[PDB]
Design a protein around this ligand. Structure first.
Ligand SMILES: [Cl-]
Ligand SMILES: [Zn+2]
Length: 79
């Protein structure tokens, strides 16, 4: 799926501090999903995969907890 959704379950979710955490997180998740699909469909080699991965996870607005969950999705043979 080429798409992702930010769901607001209350009005307090629209707070600029909440939007600023949620937008880069969802962007990293969608970029990661596309990159893993590219790798699994053999559309890019391991060297390109690792270069793109580092770009995705470089976003300073991401939590290290999220980066860890994203890196845990990488198949062992792509390292
Ligand atoms: Cl999470
Ligand atoms: Zn989690």
């Amino acid at each position: 799926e080429e798409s992702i959704s930010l769901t607001f379950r209350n009005m307090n979710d629209f707070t600029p501090e909440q939007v600023a955490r949620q937008i880069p997180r969802l962007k990293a998740m969608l970029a990661m999903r596309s990159l893993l699909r590219d790798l699994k469909a053999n559309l890019l080699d391991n060297v390109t995969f690792r270069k793109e991965l580092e770009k995705i996870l470089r976003d300073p607005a991401l939590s290290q907890t999220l980066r860890d969950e994203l890196r845990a999705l990488v198949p062992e043979k792509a390292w």
